[PDB]
Amino acid sequence: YGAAVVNIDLNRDFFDTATGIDLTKGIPLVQDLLVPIGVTAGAEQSAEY
Amino acid sequence: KPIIERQGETVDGLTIIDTSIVWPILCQCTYPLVE
Numbered sequence: 001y002g003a004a005v006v007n008i009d010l011n012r013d014f015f016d017t018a019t020g021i022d023l024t025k026g027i028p029l030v031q032d033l034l035v036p037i038g039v040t041a042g043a044e045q046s047a048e049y
Numbered sequence: 050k051p052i053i054e055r056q057g058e059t060v061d062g063l064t065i066i067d068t069s070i071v072w073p074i075l076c077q078c079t080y081p082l083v084e
Contacts, residue, residue: 038083 010028015021021028027049035044058064 038081041084 009026010023012023015023015028017023021030023029029048031048034047036047
């Protein structure tokens, strides 16, 4: 009695945080698979989606 | 007095173009690979 919001997403258990994936935001974010070759330092932070 | 003439080689490296400068730029040359 007092639940503000419920929802559905990716299970933070089958997709463990240790290997392969991470979920702090709604988007399942891994680190380095497709990094833009020739850009600035602040870029490629979206290509990890 | 012409602008371009046949004289060569001058005492400068601006005559006789070396054609062997092709193999080093295909192998022993790392580019920025595209910081």
